[PDB]
Every structure is written in structure tokens, then in C-alpha cells.
Amino acid sequence: VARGWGRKCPLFGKNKSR
């Protein structure tokens, strides 16, 4: 999930960061 994850930890948003 990003809508509730990347919003807080974007620089660490595995979705994209990883």
C-alpha cells in the first residue's frame, strides 16, 4: 500500500524507493 504508506514515508516508499 502507498496511499497510506508512501504518504508518510515517501523517501522510503518501497513501492518506488525499492
Backbone as a printed PyTorch tensor [residue, N CA C, xyz], in Angstrom:
tensor([[[ 0.8240, -1.2030,  0.0000],
         [ 0.0000,  0.0000,  0.0000],
         [ 0.8620,  1.2570,  0.0000]],

        [[ 0.4230,  2.2690, -0.7420],
         [ 1.1530,  3.5280, -0.8250],
         [ 0.2970,  4.6920, -0.3380]],

        [[-1.0010,  4.6250, -0.6190],
         [-1.9260,  5.6760, -0.2110],
         [-1.8320,  5.9280,  1.2910]],

        [[-1.4330,  4.9020,  2.0350],
         [-1.3100,  5.0330,  3.4750],
         [ 0.1020,  4.7770,  3.9620]],

        [[ 1.0230,  4.5800,  3.0250],
         [ 2.4170,  4.3200,  3.3670],
         [ 3.3290,  5.3890,  2.7740]],

        [[ 3.3280,  5.4950,  1.4490],
         [ 4.1600,  6.4800,  0.7830],
         [ 3.8610,  7.8940,  1.2370]],

        [[ 2.6210,  8.1310,  1.6540],
         [ 2.2090,  9.4510,  2.1140],
         [ 3.0240,  9.8840,  3.3270]],

        [[ 3.3820,  8.9190,  4.1680],
         [ 4.1640,  9.1990,  5.3660],
         [ 5.6550,  9.0340,  5.0940]],

        [[ 6.0300,  7.8770,  4.5580],
         [ 7.4260,  7.5950,  4.2480],
         [ 7.6390,  7.4940,  2.7410]],

        [[ 7.6730,  8.6540,  2.0680],
         [ 7.8690,  8.7220,  0.6180],
         [ 9.2820,  8.3280,  0.2040]],

        [[10.2730,  8.9320,  0.8510],
         [11.6700,  8.6440,  0.5510],
         [11.9910,  7.1740,  0.8070]],

        [[11.1360,  6.5150,  1.5820],
         [11.3280,  5.1050,  1.9030],
         [10.2220,  4.2530,  1.2880]],

        [[ 9.3420,  4.8950,  0.5250],
         [ 8.2490,  4.1810, -0.1070],
         [ 8.7300,  3.0400, -0.9820]],

        [[ 8.9950,  1.8940, -0.3650],
         [ 9.4650,  0.7220, -1.0950],
         [ 8.8560,  0.6700, -2.4920]],

        [[ 7.5560,  0.9350, -2.5760],
         [ 6.8530,  0.9190, -3.8530],
         [ 7.7350,  1.4780, -4.9660]],

        [[ 8.3700,  2.6130, -4.6960],
         [ 9.2450,  3.2530, -5.6710],
         [10.6950,  3.2340, -5.1970]],

        [[10.9090,  3.6340, -3.9470],
         [12.2500,  3.6650, -3.3740],
         [12.9550,  2.3260, -3.5670]],

        [[12.1920,  1.2420, -3.4590],
         [12.7430, -0.0980, -3.6200],
         [12.0000, -0.8630, -4.7120]]])
